[PDB]
Design an enzyme around this catalytic site. Sequence first.
Site, short mmCIF file in Angstrom:
data_model
loop_
_atom_site.label_atom_id
_atom_site.label_comp_id
_atom_site.label_asym_id
_atom_site.label_seq_id
_atom_site.Cartn_x
_atom_site.Cartn_y
_atom_site.Cartn_z
N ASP B 177 -4.60 11.93 -32.41
CA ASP B 177 -3.97 10.63 -32.22
C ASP B 177 -2.50 10.67 -32.63
O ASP B 177 -2.18 10.80 -33.82
CB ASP B 177 -4.72 9.57 -33.04
CG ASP B 177 -4.43 8.15 -32.57
OD1 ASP B 177 -3.34 7.91 -32.01
OD2 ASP B 177 -5.30 7.27 -32.77
N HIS B 269 -7.62 5.42 -20.80
CA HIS B 269 -6.77 4.84 -21.82
C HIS B 269 -5.30 5.23 -21.65
O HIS B 269 -4.42 4.37 -21.64
CB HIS B 269 -7.25 5.25 -23.21
CG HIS B 269 -6.44 4.65 -24.32
ND1 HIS B 269 -6.43 3.30 -24.60
CD2 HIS B 269 -5.61 5.22 -25.23
CE1 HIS B 269 -5.64 3.07 -25.63
NE2 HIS B 269 -5.13 4.22 -26.03
#
Lengths: 360, 360
Positions: B177, B269
């Site tokens: 991330d 996403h």
Amino acid sequence: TTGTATEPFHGPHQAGIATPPQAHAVFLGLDLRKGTGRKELGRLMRLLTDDARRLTQGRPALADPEPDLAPLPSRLTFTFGFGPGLFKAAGLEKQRPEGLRPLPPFKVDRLEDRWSGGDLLVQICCDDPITLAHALRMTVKDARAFTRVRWVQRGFRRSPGVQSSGATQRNLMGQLDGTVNPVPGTADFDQAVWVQDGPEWLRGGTTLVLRRIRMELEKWDEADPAGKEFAVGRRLTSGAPLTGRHEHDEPDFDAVDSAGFPVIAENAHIRLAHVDSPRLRMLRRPYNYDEGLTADGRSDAGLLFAAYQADIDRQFIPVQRRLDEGGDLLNLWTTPIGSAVFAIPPGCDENGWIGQGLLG
Amino acid sequence: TTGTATEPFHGPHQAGIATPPQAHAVFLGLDLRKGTGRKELGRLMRLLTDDARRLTQGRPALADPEPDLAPLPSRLTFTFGFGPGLFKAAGLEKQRPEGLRPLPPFKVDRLEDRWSGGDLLVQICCDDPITLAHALRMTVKDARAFTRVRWVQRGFRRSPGVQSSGATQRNLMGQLDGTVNPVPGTADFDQAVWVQDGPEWLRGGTTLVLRRIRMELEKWDEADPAGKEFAVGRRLTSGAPLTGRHEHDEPDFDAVDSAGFPVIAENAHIRLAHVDSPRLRMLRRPYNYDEGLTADGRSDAGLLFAAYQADIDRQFIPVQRRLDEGGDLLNLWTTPIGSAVFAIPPGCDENGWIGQGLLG
Ligand code: HEM
Ligand code: HEM
């Protein structure tokens, strides 16, 4: 590196005790479901054993829900403990150490059920909180079927690399904490920590007294700094006894001030807590906690007081009793709100599992 | 050892934004008391400025309740933010940025008041949790008279030294991330983060969108592993786009499979989240949270999503709106439960204080 470093899982003792305390810890307190007997406990401990066996070495667990979080073990350790209720469920009430029982009441106690008791302990320590979170998830995954979560207590110490190894770290009251403590790899430590008498299965293991103690920091701030040091018997900055100069100086309990009064108060924390025999001392391996604020900004912080000893009746209760009846000045600013006891079995090798000598 | 490392408090910008994210964070959301107006806000920010000025450099604050916890700052940073309600109480509506307002409703939202809003933000980041806890204590001490604690949100990343600085770290869903982000030290970063339009006082500052996003780890474990990667548009282990091999490979949004369907889903996403222009990108600087367990072993964990940008309306909302309207596959396992917005003033020097250009 800090990430790739590991602690051995196998050995005569379970890791997470003599192991120099890592930066983070979670104490998971589990209650057995009704259907969970000796058979089920065997299956459970074998599951958790192999989980720890793999995860502590940076390898994914069996049926790991997130294997990419297994690497970077960061000195992950597991320590499993059995509460009093474990043994009856296993039909092994005879092998329960007579000393293994909920602590007696103390005048300072304000214990809460949500922070007390427990049939099964999983103590997970780690230098990294992401690795810890993953280890916790895997633990719950395999324990879910057989147990309910009674409580989960998280704590922290200094991050890795902030202070040198072995150097004394401070608690959330600013006090250096851990000066007088059994040293791993010494004779006094082994005698103080590891069980030698009692039921056979527990030999090579130890016992844990886990008490959640709240720090009344609002009261603490209103206290006099001289009063703060007087309450403990040591100076805040140096950590030295009031009778001494350096941290490691031996406190002089016979020294008196200009008034002929004891320099270290008769009801000072370290006086009441002291035991002259090193082999009867307890291993303190605490973690700090800090959890949220009231609207008026009042803290919910304190200490996860973890004490390890061979005999609770001989090594812990006498100390705790003296603190209570002795009127320890430190009790003005600290409050026990949780208490649990666990029998921590000996370690295992590649050919066994934690608790095999009992549940096998 | 790393405890002595510091981050500059003074500068054209506040620290804790371009600052490489430290291992620990607390986001303190404060609501102003009834009698707290512009005068009172001035006194508060002067107090908090000096606290940060001293504590970040390892010096005790004025009236520090525990001065021995000030040394070893471990890159402690303070970042102060002003919410919409701040301007009302101060009577400076004219100075409030047009875009500084509660975010519009989104379908996926399950917002809770206890995690949303706030008049005043104190974002405290630190590589050490003891230093952090002490900084939080001092903040509340001086803020108590003027404010009520609306919420406190604690988060963590990797411990210092676990991974090399700048290396992408994984979240609690195991996903790398932070791959695509503006990089400090570049002109594009300055354009994307630092305000250069709007009211004069905010120039050199930025805006923060803080959203508490719960991770539905129950569903996540049950989810199809290939579906999990397909939901994001990247592989779990490598972090590479499905169209590539390495993490930092550019995602090919025009690529199709042998069947003629997009390799990266139309509702993946990263596709819905992507913006072509680097200068329009938001700075993502998130922290992970993991908070306790239900009796039957369900976790309460997720992400503290902190996005920094020069303009909320131009840089955040358009992205969030595409994720919602586009039916982001990641929404199946993530749920926003908190939302707050803040205007972060520019930095200050000696003799100055944070927010002086506005409140002074
Ligand atoms: C609850 C919050 C507590 C705090 C903040 C605290 C703090 C301290 C401090 C600052 C010291 C001196 C430095 C050191 O030797 O570690 C100390 C010593 C000690 N504490 Fe505590 N303590 C707490 C509770 C307890 C409890 C409940 C026990 C029960 C046994 C205990 C047992 C001891 C012992 C055995 C020593 C060694 C004293 C000596 O022999 O010199 N502490 N503690
Ligand atoms: C729990 C919630 C979320 C998780 C777990 C998550 C996870 C991820 C992952 C794994 C990536 C790909 C690696 C990377 O480039 O960082 C990514 C990219 C990104 N995410 Fe999210 N995300 C979440 C919420 C959000 C939200 C609410 C936004 C709102 C704008 C957002 C904006 C972005 C952006 C802009 C990118 C860059 C993608 C690109 O341009 O290629 N994320 N996220």
